[PDB]
Amino acid sequence: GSNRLVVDEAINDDNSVVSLHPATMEKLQLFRGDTILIKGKKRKDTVCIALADETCEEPKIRMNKVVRSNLRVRLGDVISVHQCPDVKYGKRVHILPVDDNLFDAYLKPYFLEAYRPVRKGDLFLVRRSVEFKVIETDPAEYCVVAPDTEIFCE
């Protein structure tokens, strides 16, 4: 059908997850847990994991604040989504602590077996809680974090 969706508040705060009514999912030929590149404003864009959600309105998409900012979109704006099958797991992900191993007393937990999707330039949070700017990825665009991925930053 249409690939444009009206932004809405998320109940789940996982910075890697957006939610879509299950009709919307199937109209876009998405499966639970797939990876979609959602296009935002100022030509920003991110990769997320798509969960189905009966509480989400069809012409909408539930996404948390960390995503919103990464897409620079307010509650009530209009994103577009895309199938992103070309993604593979990662090798070198560089993560600069924005606010300025104890580095990995926050970061290793957040990525442990989580298999989270990363895009060059994202900002994200880990619960005290810290923000992190992925300033380097191995495919230079987007990559997932397998248990053999290198988080070679403080």
Swiss-Prot record:
In-chain residues carrying the UniProt-annotated modification Phosphoserine: 16
Post-translational modification: Phosphorylated on at least one threonine residue and on Ser-16 by SERK1.
Localization per Swiss-Prot or TrEMBL: Nucleus; Cytoplasm, Cytoskeleton, Phragmoplast; Cell membrane
Biological function: Probably functions in cell division and growth processes. Interacts with certain SNAREs as part of specialized membrane fusion events where vesicles from the same organelle fuse (homotypic fusion).
Family: Belongs to the AAA ATPase family.
Subunit (UniProt): Homohexamer. Interacts with SERK1, GRF6, KAPP and SYP31, but not with KNOLLE. Component of the SERK1 signaling complex, composed of KAPP, CDC48A, GRF6 or GRF7, SERK1, SERK2, SERK3/BAK1 and BRI1. Interacts with PUX1, PUX2, PUX3, PUX4, PUX5, PUX7 and PUX11 via its N-terminus.
Designated name of the protein: Cell division control protein 48 homolog A
Organism, scientific name: Arabidopsis thaliana (Mouse-ear cress)
Lineage, top ranks: Eukaryota, Viridiplantae, Streptophyta, Embryophyta, Tracheophyta
